[PDB]
Amino acid sequence: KYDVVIVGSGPIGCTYARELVGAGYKVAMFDIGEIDSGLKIGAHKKNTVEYQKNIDKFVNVIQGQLMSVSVPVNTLVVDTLSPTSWQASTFFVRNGSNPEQDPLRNLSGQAVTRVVGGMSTAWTCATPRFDREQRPLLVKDDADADDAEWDRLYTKAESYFQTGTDQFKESIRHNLVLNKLTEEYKGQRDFQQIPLAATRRSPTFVEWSSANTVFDLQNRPNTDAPEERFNLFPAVACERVVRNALNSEIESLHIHDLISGDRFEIKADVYVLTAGAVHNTQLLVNSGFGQLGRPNPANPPELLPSLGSYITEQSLVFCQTVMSTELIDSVKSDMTIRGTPGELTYSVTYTPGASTNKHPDWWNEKVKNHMMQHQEDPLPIPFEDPEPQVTTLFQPSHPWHTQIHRDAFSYGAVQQSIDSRLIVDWRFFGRTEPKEENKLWFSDKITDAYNMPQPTFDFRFPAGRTSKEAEDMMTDMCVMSAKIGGFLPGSLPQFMEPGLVLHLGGTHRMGFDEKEDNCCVNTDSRVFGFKNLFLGGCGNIPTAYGANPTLTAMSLAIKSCEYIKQNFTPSPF
Amino acid sequence: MDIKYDVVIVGSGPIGCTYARELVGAGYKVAMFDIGEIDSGLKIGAHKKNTVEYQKNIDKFVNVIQGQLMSVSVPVNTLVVDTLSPTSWQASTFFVRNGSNPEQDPLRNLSGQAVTRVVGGMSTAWTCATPRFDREQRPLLVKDDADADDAEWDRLYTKAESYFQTGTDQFKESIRHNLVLNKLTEEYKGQRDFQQIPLAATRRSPTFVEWSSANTVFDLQNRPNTDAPEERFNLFPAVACERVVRNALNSEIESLHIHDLISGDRFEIKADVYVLTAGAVHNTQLLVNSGFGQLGRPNPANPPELLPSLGSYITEQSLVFCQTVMSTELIDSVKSDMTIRGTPGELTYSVTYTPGASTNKHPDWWNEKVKNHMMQHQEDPLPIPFEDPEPQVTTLFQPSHPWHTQIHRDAFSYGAVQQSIDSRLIVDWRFFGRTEPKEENKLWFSDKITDAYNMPQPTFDFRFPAGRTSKEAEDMMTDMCVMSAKIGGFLPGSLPQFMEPGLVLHLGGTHRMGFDEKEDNCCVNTDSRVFGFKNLFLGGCGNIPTAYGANPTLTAMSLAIKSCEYIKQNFTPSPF
Amino acid sequence: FSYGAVQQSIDSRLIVDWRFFGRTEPKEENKLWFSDKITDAYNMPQPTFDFRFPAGRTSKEAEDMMTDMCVMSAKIGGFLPGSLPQFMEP
Amino acid sequence: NTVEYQKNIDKFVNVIQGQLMSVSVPVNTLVVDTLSPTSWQASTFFVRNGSNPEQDPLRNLSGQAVTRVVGGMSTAWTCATPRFDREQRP
Ligand SMILES: Cc1cc2nc3c(=O)[nH]c(=O)nc-3n(C[C@H](O)[C@H](O)[C@H](O)COP(=O)(O)OP(=O)(O)OC[C@H]3O[C@@H](n4cnc5c(N)ncnc54)[C@H](O)[C@@H]3O)c2cc1C
Ligand SMILES: Cc1cc2nc3c(=O)[nH]c(=O)nc-3n(C[C@H](O)[C@H](O)[C@H](O)COP(=O)(O)OP(=O)(O)OC[C@H]3O[C@@H](n4cnc5c(N)ncnc54)[C@H](O)[C@@H]3O)c2cc1C
Ligand SMILES: Cc1cc2nc3c(=O)[nH]c(=O)nc-3n(C[C@H](O)[C@H](O)[C@H](O)COP(=O)(O)OP(=O)(O)OC[C@H]3O[C@@H](n4cnc5c(N)ncnc54)[C@H](O)[C@@H]3O)c2cc1C
Ligand SMILES: OC[C@H]1O[C@@H](O)[C@H](F)[C@@H](O)[C@H]1O
Ligand SMILES: OC[C@H]1O[C@@H](O)[C@H](F)[C@@H](O)[C@H]1O
């Protein structure tokens, strides 16, 4: 028996933990996955010296933990088996595939992670705020009050994640790209550092934030927090919340301990679901909310008829570029270079402080030292120079988020032919209109690896604005990137597999009125009709958004915790 | 961090952990340093495959493996990229990029050789195959008394097996395992014996195996603790060990020079006993960075002062591979004992069998599983249950087939995972050749190029020796083709091939063992002591000086147990 | 004259090729010469190229050309996977 | 101009490829290290298979090819015959 139970130990469940453990509630958190970021529980797995010295390897860590949500039945023809090998006569259900899934209306890229810390063990840490156009209303009829409220929540969310915009400020590659784009779009678009949840520890190491940053996940009481109460239970699959007969309260949470095999009913005052956008929905549907099985408009749901409808997933376009000769020459614009490289006669110098210098003293010093210590190298950029981290944020005239950077989540084989210092990634992210026909549903027959109802997508990017902006977005990437360099062969401009972006929202969407706003939670993230059931995560977000959604889901979780503090009293210690 | 210990061990792989288990147990104040960090859950240095999620999604684990294997020597890239935009910065030469090694001849490399820097080392992701070597593959520990030599290795191997929890019955009730085992036993009746791959692993449930690791050998928890209140052990992760400092007389090690990667601070650690267990590549690197052997391109015209055999006579196994898709014959034989009423999914479908019937081809445990699968899943066209464990079959190295063999399913898949053919039907074949030690095959270190930790860049100069090594390698390929055909045809996309040299990760002989430094061309004696040094010991596969086909870790561990016996007799622990 | 594996999943009625062709400034240093030792298949001096697209106008136009192809093509449809915008082999 | 090719236009690329002979192919430096130990193998990237050792791979026109047939390349060409405007014309 606990005051609060939280399903999921991602960054959003950790937000609930930090708020509610902090205010003195007795909290239990269950996660279906296990501890594997080392001694700091739920921490970013990229925070090893080894991964940051070998960053091209990290993509493997991400791929290891990302399990595809719905894989349609495979129909690839293999007709060169030996005549002695066993072969089927049909494309039968094999290898975990989902026979419910139409392969042409899928988010083939969508995937889920089952580990303590969730996806924040592996994420890219981009945490931009949404502007009003992308953002749901928390107060209607008063835009200054709405703005004030979001600014308060976002500022709080940013302190939890340690969000900042200074961590790449002395990178030459970063500044080279930032300044070129600033100049080229002067007075049309503004560029800045991607806001990133991260603290720099040294010139060659960044401590990336994670769920662990929000809440350390240590059991309490402990020496540092002797008046607090928290228990984390990993390797526990939460399966159902049990409703009372009147559908006004949750009575227990049914769990299955994956190590012992035991099953229990846990009791709490407050039930918080933060299992991610796909798995929150699964749990809810397995508990008799919305509709199990293939959508049947003729058999309309008892509860939450909008559950798993109006799903949004962003369009994503991507390429990489190889830095222009002109930009590479400009790196060394302030330098005087004499003699020939590799001889005793060679010299590279600059005038410190000269207001005609195109670059600051710290840049010139690093170029100089590099050119002088590595005279065999043809490039002026230092070998350990950090990557670019540049964005121009969503605006009505360019309604897409942009990242101009180097991501550890590369999408094709890492090429080795072109020097890494030259390469920039471009990712532009489009917003998707919520439409009732776009659905996440759960089979009544097929089950997944944890014996829960199999997720199935029925999705296409909506015609009209969504698709028009997607293609405009592609053009914009092509136009903008060319200012920096030509496309890298093997990473030519393309749309990524639907869902690979992992910014799925709207599966259990928020709104003011259940019927009028076709939604499932109110602005306290409380499930309509239920006193004591709260959902957290990107599945709450009901709008078309282009920016990375995590900071916004966190802000909503902060507001939700405010309601919980006003309505439930912690038990005596 | 104390500055003074009884014993310091560089590296937290299973071999370092053997030294720790033996010397912490015996009362020595032990520190262990690892350049890598703690990542595998609450059990320090444990197998990463031991999660519910990986064992329900075993095909994802190849990502974990790939994520932690860092190539040792990548030659300068000479791929022509001639479709860059005319505005892009374009190379005039194939210059040194992306951590490539200009010392490395691309045609005399172990391009697949890789290293892991994490606490527990490579045992965090290995396959756990631990066979013993027979005489032919195995260095001598006793001269001129083969029976005493065998007795000494049995004693060592038995202990090493108990440390790793090696077993040969974890897969005894797998249908796929037995289907393969029985067909191969029958086909080679009176010619070759087949058994389960000896595996370092404990079965915990019908669907979960606790694979062994460094953590199995030694739990890597600091001591003293409640469970060991009189023991003294500290593990220091993210500590790059750079040099052992030799005294001027070249008779003792005086300190271990370390660099803490998090603080940036450097220290000189003092110990009575120094043990290097950094892997076959990195033990050699550390020795060469400390003045042993010869730094730079090999040069006879000035032989090294100390350990002139260091980094020569290196051995790496040839590895051949394919996968097969199970024959129609064998798959039909899975259900040979079943009585099947009517048609699947239809009302009067029943599948039954007679337990104990003498005419039954298979045991009751097999039929019960098949029956239950065919009845619970009548849509599925195969008789193999969905959760049936993988095959784990070998015919071990012999004089008439001088290669080790694994007929199995390895988490370490070599190409993209194929999804079209049902996984129940797929069997992997890996055959492993032995390589003659030759002085010309070398691991050396650049005197100019450095790696990511600023240590001298490893460089290989290697070819499979002509003569027996090469003859055997090609004969082994043919053997794999002929043997595999008895089970099924080749899986397209996994046709029979030699793997990139060194992908097998069984590199030996980089700091090889022998009796006499000069007559046996070696670096350590049979106590694993570096010649001429009182207090310096090397552990790991680099010790093994012979041409072996089987997986070497068990043998390296056995050497390490011997070495601890010498240490316990020659050094006294400090008072507690 | 198609340039990569011809794809069969997208109906060919939907497919349009875009080829934009840049002009290249003549530069003394851009050469075709013939070996005095190596011969071709008909025993004649083996042709050798020494060629880069000139910096300056030629390169600036080539990249602007690429941009114009991405901009114009989008009016008609999006890129076909496997025939994404690229410079072809010189 | 055959009924068969214009009914199967996708196949004509092979005609064109069959008669285009590359002008200058640089010595190949692809590393093939999975040969059987018994196979004969190279110690160096020697001149093989018609390659040109004079050719700098990085200053080439690798796509340049020639056709040796009566009618020359007009046996396979695309037939686009525009005029040059003054800007392009000698
Ligand atoms: C490679 C990568 C890059 C990304 N980069 C960014 C970026 O830069 N910015 C950003 O805004 N977003 C990014 N994201 C997405 C971001 O990680 C998620 O939005 C965020 O982690 C969601 O938080 P959450 O707590 O709702 O869910 P999750 O992090 O998905 O965690 C939910 C959890 O609950 C668990 N669980 C699931 N089902 C059950 C169940 N039945 N019972 C018990 N527990 C259960 C899981 O095991 C898991 O820990 C990225 C994701 C990936 C993988
Ligand atoms: C996927 C795969 C499958 C394998 N399969 C098996 C098989 O089934 N059976 C078989 O016998 N073996 C197999 N192996 C090989 C086996 O893992 C190794 O032989 C074994 O781990 C060697 O142990 P070790 O302790 O000598 O070194 P390692 O496990 O390599 O550990 C050495 C360590 O020292 C550290 N270190 C390195 N340099 C420094 C330094 N300068 N300072 C401080 N620390 C340092 C490392 O971080 C590391 O932890 C496999 C390996 C892989 C990766
Ligand atoms: C697939 C393709 C598409 C094309 N599309 C177009 C198009 O749309 N537009 C256009 O303007 N251009 C196009 N071209 C280019 C056009 O084909 C050439 O510009 C044109 O054919 C050149 O004509 P030519 O007579 O100068 O040389 P070629 O057609 O090359 O003919 C030269 C000939 O001389 C021969 N020969 C070579 N050496 C010797 C020797 N030593 N002794 C004797 N004979 C010799 C040949 O065998 C050959 O028949 C295309 C080319 C091809 C292959
Ligand atoms: O593909 C997952 C994506 O997640 C997004 O949030 C990141 F910003 C992208 O860079 C990418 O990593
Ligand atoms: O390629 C690495 C190899 O290591 C060997 O020891 C294993 F036995 C093989 O199965 C394979 O995993």
- Which atom of ligand 1 is nearest to A450's Cα? 41
Helix axes A361-373, A172-184, angle to 10 degrees: 130
> Which tokens belong to A345?
């006669």
Cβ atoms of B496 and B480 within 8 Å: the answer is yes
Chains in touch with C (≥3 Cβ pairs < 8 A):
A, B, D
Q: Do chains B and D touch (3 or more CB pairs under 8 A)?
A: yes
Query: Of the candidates B242, B424, B250, B231, which has an alpha carbon nearest to the alpha carbon of residue B324?
Result: B424
- Which atom of ligand 4 is nearest to A500's Cα? 1
Would you tell me how many other CB atoms lie within 10 Å of the CB of residue A264? 13
Can you give the residue range of the structural domain that contains A422?
1-323+386-573
Cβ atoms of B34 and A31 within 8 Å: the answer is no
Chain B residues whose beta carbon lies within 8 Å of the beta carbon of residue C4:
none
Q: Whose CA is nearest to atom 4 of ligand 3?
A: D77
Question: Ligand 1 center to residue A10 CA distance, Å?
Answer: 6
Beta carbons within 8 Å of B569's beta carbon, 6+ residues apart: none
Last residue of a domain, one of A369, A385, A401: A385
Closest ligand to residue B220's CA: 2
Same domain, B337 and B450: no
Cα–Cα distance between A459 and A499 in angstroms, integer?
Answer: 10
Q: How far is CA C5 from the centre of its chain?
A: 17
SS3 B298: coil
> Which tokens belong to B103?
């010392």
How many CA atoms lie less than 13 Å away from B541 in the CB half-sphere? Answer: 23
Q: For the stretch B505-523, what's the b/e string if a residue is b when 16 or more beta carbons lie within 10 angstroms of its beta carbon?
A: bbbbbbbbbbeebeebbbb
Cα–Cα distance between A114 and B455 in angstroms, integer?
Answer: 37
- CB of B320 closer than 6 A to ligand 5? no
Would you tell me how many other CB atoms lie within 10 Å of the CB of residue A566? 8
Query: At residue C27, what are phi and psi to the nearest 5 degrees?
Result: -130, 130
Query: At residue A500, what are phi and psi to the nearest 5 degrees?
Result: -65, -25
Cβ atoms of D33 and B500 within 8 Å: the answer is yes
Beta carbons within 8 Å of C11's beta carbon, 6+ residues apart: none
> Nearest by CB to D54, which of C46, C51, C90?
C46
Residue B272 one-letter amino acid: D
Last residue of a domain, one of A335, A360, A385: A385
Q: For the stretch B459-490, what's the b/e string if a residue is b when 16 or more beta carbons lie within 10 angstroms of its beta carbon?
A: bbbbbbbeeebbebbbbbbebbbebbebbbbb
From A279, A503, A508, A540, the catalytic residue: A503
Q: Which of D9, D12, D70, D73 to mutate to test the pocket of ligand 3 (most atoms within 8 A of CB)?
A: D73
Query: Of the candidates B468, B420, B460, B428, which has an alpha carbon nearest to the alpha carbon of residue B443?
Result: B460
Interface probe for B, chosen from A415, A418, A488 (most Cβ of B below 10 Å), is: A418
Pairing label, strands B70-71, B29-33: unpaired
- CB of A30 closer than 6 A to ligand 1? yes
Query: At residue A389, what are phi and psi to the nearest 5 degrees?
Result: -145, 65
Distance from CA of C65 to the nearest CA of D (A): 16
- Which atom of ligand 2 is nearest to B241's Cα? 42
Closest ligand to residue B551's CA: 2
- Contact yes or no for C67 and A479 at CB 8 A: yes
- Contact yes or no for B66 and A57 at CB 8 A: yes
Residue of C nearest to B90 (CA): C52
> Which tokens belong to A451?
């014996």
- Which atom of ligand 2 is nearest to B114's Cα? 53
Question: Ligand 5 center to residue B505 CA distance, Å?
Answer: 7
B551 annotated active-site: yes
SS3 B482: helix
Cα–Cα distance between B285 and A172 in angstroms, integer?
Answer: 33
- Contact yes or no for A479 and C70 at CB 8 A: yes
Cα–Cα distance between C60 and B433 in angstroms, integer?
Answer: 56
* Length of chain B as a residue count: 576
Chain D residues whose beta carbon lies within 8 Å of the beta carbon of residue C6:
10, 13
Interface probe for A, chosen from B12, B95, B97 (most Cβ of A below 10 Å), is: B97
Same domain, B214 and B346: no
Cα–Cα distance between B428 and B324 in angstroms, integer?
Answer: 7
- Contact yes or no for C87 and B84 at CB 8 A: yes
Cα–Cα distance between A1 and A19 in angstroms, integer?
Answer: 19
Exposed/middle/buried for C86, CB within 10 Å: 0-12, 13-18, 19+?
Answer: middle
The 8-class DSSP code of residue C88 comes to P
Task: Give me the residue label for tokens 């509610």.
Answer: A20
Task: Give me the residue label for tokens 């097929």.
Answer: A446
Same domain, B332 and B346: yes
Please state the three-class secondary structure of D12-81 as a single string. HHHHHHHHCEECCCECCCCCCCCCCCCCCCCCCCCCCCCCECCCCHHHCCCCCEECCCCCHHHHCCCCCC
Q: Percentages helix, strand, coil for chain B, rounded to the nearest 5? A: 25, 25, 50
Chain B residues whose beta carbon lies within 8 Å of the beta carbon of residue C62:
85-87
Cβ atoms of A527 and A496 within 8 Å: the answer is no
Same domain, A409 and A380: no
Interface of B with C (CB under 8 A): 82-87, 90
Task: Give me the residue label for tokens 């919340």.
Answer: A241
From B373, B408, B506, B511, the catalytic residue: B506
- For the CA atoms of chain C, what is the radius of gyration? 18
Residue of D nearest to B106 (CA): D31
Cβ atoms of B461 and B108 within 8 Å: the answer is yes
Exposed/middle/buried for B21, CB within 10 Å: 0-12, 13-18, 19+?
Answer: buried
Same domain, B458 and B433: yes
> Nearest by CB to B67, which of A57, A324, A422?
A57
Same domain, A275 and A346: no
Query: Of the candidates B463, B313, B393, B397, which has an alpha carbon nearest to the alpha carbon of residue B137?
Result: B397
Same domain, B371 and B463: no
Cβ atoms of A483 and A458 within 8 Å: the answer is no
- CB of B392 closer than 6 A to ligand 5? no
Beta strand residue intervals within A63-159, DSSP E: 67-68, 111-112
Question: Ligand 4 center to residue A429 CA distance, Å?
Answer: 9
- Contact yes or no for D33 and B78 at CB 8 A: no
Q: For the stretch A212-226, what's the b/e string if a residue is b when 16 or more beta carbons lie within 10 angstroms of its beta carbon?
A: bbbbbbeebeeeeee
Exposed/middle/buried for A202, CB within 10 Å: 0-12, 13-18, 19+?
Answer: exposed
Structural domains of chain A, count: 2
SS3 A517: coil
Cβ atoms of A199 and A166 within 8 Å: the answer is no
Cα–Cα distance between B405 and B395 in angstroms, integer?
Answer: 6
Same domain, A295 and A332: no
Q: What ranges in B459-523 are assigned the alpha helix state H?
A: 468-484
Angle at B196 between CA B191 and CA B199, to 5 degrees: 140
Task: Give me the residue label for tokens 């991501």.
Answer: A407
Same domain, B212 and B179: yes
Q: Whose CA is nearest to atom 4 of ligand 4?
A: A501
> Which tokens belong to D73?
């390349």
Query: What resolution in angstroms does the PDB record give?
Result: 2.0
Give me the CATH number covering residue A351: 3.30.1920.50
Same domain, A283 and A370: no
- Method by which the coordinates were obtained: X-ray
Same domain, B342 and B211: no
Cβ atoms of A149 and A524 within 8 Å: the answer is no
Q: Whose CA is nearest to atom 24 of ligand 3?
A: D72
Cα–Cα distance between B137 and B140 in angstroms, integer?
Answer: 10
Chain A residues whose beta carbon lies within 8 Å of the beta carbon of residue C70:
474-475, 478-479, 493
Chain D residues whose beta carbon lies within 8 Å of the beta carbon of residue B78:
29, 57
- Which atom of ligand 5 is nearest to B112's Cα? 1
Same domain, B275 and B379: no
Q: What ranges in A211-268 are assigned the alpha helix state H?
A: 211-214
Question: Ligand 2 center to residue B116 CA distance, Å?
Answer: 7
Pairing label, strands B266-276, B4-10: parallel
Q: Whose CA is nearest to atom 4 of ligand 5?
A: B504
B506 annotated active-site: yes
